[PDB]
Structure formats: C-alpha cells, structure tokens
Design a protein around this nucleic acid. Structure first.
Length: 408
DNA sequence: TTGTGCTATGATATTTTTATGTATGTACAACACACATCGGCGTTCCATAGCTATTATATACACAGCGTGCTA
C-alpha cells in the first residue's frame, strides 16, 4: 500500500536512532509495516498486545514472512513459553503479564530472562491510545531499545495524556487521512446520522426528576426510541442489509434484544454461545440483526452489516464509541461501486445524552467523515407492527420503567 | 453572624477482562489381600451276488402221529 511506503521512507531516510508513532486504519496493513521494519533491523522484536487473537495474527504475519518454529521466534504467554536466540527474534507479549505487581505463576522469570539477558532492539506497541496508564509507564520504564515504533489507529482522548506520548515513545511521524485512503481503497463511505425522536411528557418530567446514570434508564427506554428502532430494523431488512446494534448498557441491550427477538452477546456470557451466534451471523441469512455490547466489539469486528445503530451511551466515552465505530467502518472493505455505510444515533429531544453524542459527532468531524441530521424518515407512520405506539403500552412501559427505577 | 456556591482533592461508585486456585468431571491403574493353582443320530433307496424250493434213486436210523387189542 502506497501510504505504507510513505511511512517506510522515514525509516529509509536516517536509518539509525528513530522513534515515532504511525497512524494507520485497522483494515490497513500496519503489521506488514512491522514485518518490513523487522526485516530492516533484524533483531529481537517484542510486540506488546492486549489479546491473544492479536498474538495469533502477528504469528500469522511471521508465517507470511519466514520461520517461526526454529529456536528464534519466541512466544510469551501465561500458557506456555518458547526459547529465543540473539541477532534475530520475533516475540509477542501481553501488557498484564509483563506489568503485574506481586502475583506470579512461575512465568515472570521467563519474561525477566528476555528483559534481563538484554535481547532487544525494536519495540512495537499495538494500540498506542491505551498507553496513557500507569502500567504502560512501568512497561516503558522496564524496557530500553535502539528503535521504537508505535502502531495505532486513533488517538482521541479527553484525559489530556495523549500529548505525553511525544516523549514517552516519540512524536507522531505520519498521520494518514482516512478520506484519501477511502479514495485509494473503498473502506465504506461513512454516513453519520442522528435520529431525533420526540420525547413523551411522563418520561420527560420523570427524566428531570432523575439524575446521574439512572436517568439513562429513562433516556433509552423511551417508546419513540422503540418505534424508530423497529422502523430502522424493518427498513434495513427491507433493503437487504444486516444490522448491528451497539449499547453501552447491558440492561438496555437485553431489553431491546428480548423485545426484538434477536441474539445478544453481553458480559458473563459463555464463549460457545458467542461463537454460535457469530457463526449464525456469518452463515445464516435469517439472522441479520445482532445486539453486541463492548465485549462483542472489542474482541472481534465483522466485515458484514453496513447498518450500525447506536442506542445506549455513556458520558465522556464518546471517543471510544467513535473508535469502535471506526473499527467497524474500516473492517468493511471490498471495493464496491456503492458501499454506503449508515450510522444512526437514536437520540431523544431535551435529554442530557444527545449533548455528548454531539461531541462524538465532533470527533467524527475531526476525522473528515460526513455528518447530517435526521429528524424522522417518513414511513414509520405506515408500520402497524410498532410497539409502544398506543397509550396503553406507553403507560405499561412507564410502569415498567418506574419499577426499574425502584429496583436501582 | 450565619448560610450558600465554586476549585480542587478526597473518596465513593461502575465496568471490562487477564489469569488463578478450587471444584467438577473423567482417566488410570493399581494394591494388596482374596483367591487360585500345584505337590511331597435314524431311516430309506439302489446295485450286487448268493440263495431259496424240487426230484429221479439207493441205503439205514430216528422221530411224531395214527389204528388197533385189554382191562378195569
């Protein structure tokens, strides 16, 4: 990819003594850039990752290059260990395993052999936006190499600590514009859209009488959000496109999941059921609407479903939802003549959550994506299958929300 | 004088996910007495070769049955 050689030209310029951060999309090949840099340096390279799936991907890249089984390419994890050799090495480690404090499973010595014997020379950190934390400062404080590299896709955080990475690892060298990359490769056009649904009177006065995170249980459970949600679901099913529903709250995800009758993936869920739901979403055309929480978004991103719906949200964590949204957008690439990606933000008027979703839309403006407002698409008035459209169901839902407030 | 409001820290309240020690399900073999071993056939069809009854005649000998005399 041209931008990858545009990033490698900086390494080809000076050669020795260099450190910086390279911003590349998730769908791009930053791991290939790490492989090329590993071929240019030829030394013990350590790749800092947070999940085993990324370790398996880096191992697959090592297989795409050459060798992995002979005593040279090592693997560090809490399950097994593998030997290494000087002058050339490729190993992937976990942040929580290298960090620690005093808990030990007779494996911290195996890491202190890679760090004690001084077999290093190249540092690779996956997702640098997570570095602003004490454990990563300890990791950097326990390592020292000749060349450092930071592979990440985003860096927008409101912790005011992203600027420290300019001296902890190095200043950002190349930031690729996702619009020009969309022109190089169709990574699904980004259509940002907020749905403005009216707010009922009872949920408005009860919403004002509530506060903190409890008023979210009155912002999400609005009947017009169920009507507009069903209208968007039936609309996308009529267009023949799969639907992914995001929710920062597990309770709302279970409510919409059970009321819509679709599979759901949330916390404390068996992994076999998660894999079954994933296979049903990949193969079965009857399941075109999945309800995914943060566990289903951080662990895996699927290239299907051009329809992304956002209902639940948390205060301040708008940039993280923009990063996950960006992961689902960049995950969809196949060079199509159309390829229209639709992001809907179900927001209710006069609520305290839309005013942060606007900050998320500001993050979506900083990336160059297109944003437009949507009050209501004509067609919901012709859907007799809408729930909570009658005053009876609205009063019953009001009583259910009041009971939910009495439980919390 | 006493009550009320913002900066900042202090503490208090949520959320996701790594491995870990204990629990649960499932193998394995296996220990040492409990026990074991040892000894100083019936039934039917076809080709085969022997084997059945008879006599003309002499000789002599034994065996079973019948016709006639005597007396009680």
């Amino acid at each position: 990819r041209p931008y990858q050689e545009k990033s490698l030209s900086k390494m080809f310029g000076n050669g020795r003594a260099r450190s910086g951060i390279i911003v590349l999309p998730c769908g791009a090949g930053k791991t290939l850039v790490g492989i090329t840099a590993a071929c240019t340096i030829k030394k013990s390279v350590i790749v800092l990752c947070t999940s085993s799936v990324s370790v398996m991907q880096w191992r697959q890249q090592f297989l795409x290059x050459x060798x992995x089984x002979x005593x040279x390419x090592x693997x560090x994890x809490x399950x097994x260990x593998x030997x290494x050799x000087x002058x050339x090495x490729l190993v992937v480690s976990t942040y929580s395993m290298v960090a620690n404090x005093x808990x030990x499973x007779x494996x911290x010595x195996x890491x202190x052999x890679x760090x004690x014997x001084x077999x290093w020379g190249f540092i690779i950190l996956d997702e640098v936006h997570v570095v602003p934390a004490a454990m990563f400062r300890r990791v950097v404080s326990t390592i020292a190499a000749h060349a450092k590299l930071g592979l990440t896709a985003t860096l927008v955080r409101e912790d005011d600590k992203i600027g420290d990475l300019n001296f902890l690892i190095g200043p950002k060298l190349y930031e690729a514009n996702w619009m020009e990359l969309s022109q190089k490769g169709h990574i699904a056009n980004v259509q940002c859209a907020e749905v403005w649904c009216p707010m009922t009177a009872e949920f408005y006065q009860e919403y004002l009488r509530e506060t903190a995170r409890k008023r979210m249980l009155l912002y999400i459970m609005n009947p017009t959000k169920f009507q507009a949600c069903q209208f968007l679901i039936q609309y996308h099913e009529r267009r023949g496109d799969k639907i992914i529903v995001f929710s920062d709250n597990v309770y709302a995800l279970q409510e919409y999941a059970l009321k819509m009758g679709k599979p759901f993936i949330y916390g404390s869920t068996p992994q076999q059921e998660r894999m079954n739901i994933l296979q049903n979403f990949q193969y079965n055309d009857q399941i075109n609407t999945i309800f995914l929480s943060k566990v289903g978004d951080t662990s895996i991103d699927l290239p299907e479903a051009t329809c992304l719906i956002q209902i639940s949200s948390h205060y301040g964590s708008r940039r993280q939802e923009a990063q996950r949204l960006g992961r689902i957008l960049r995950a969809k690439r196949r060079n199509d003549e159309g390829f229209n990606a639709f992001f809907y933000s179900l927001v209710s008027k006069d609520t305290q959550e839309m005013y942060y979703s606007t900050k998320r839309q500001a993050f979506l403006v900083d990336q160059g994506y297109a944003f437009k407002v949507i009050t209501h698409l004509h067609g919901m008035e012709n859907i007799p299958n809408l729930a909570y459209a009658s005053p009876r169901e609205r009063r019953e839902l009001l009583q259910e929300v009041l009971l939910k407030n009495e439980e919390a």
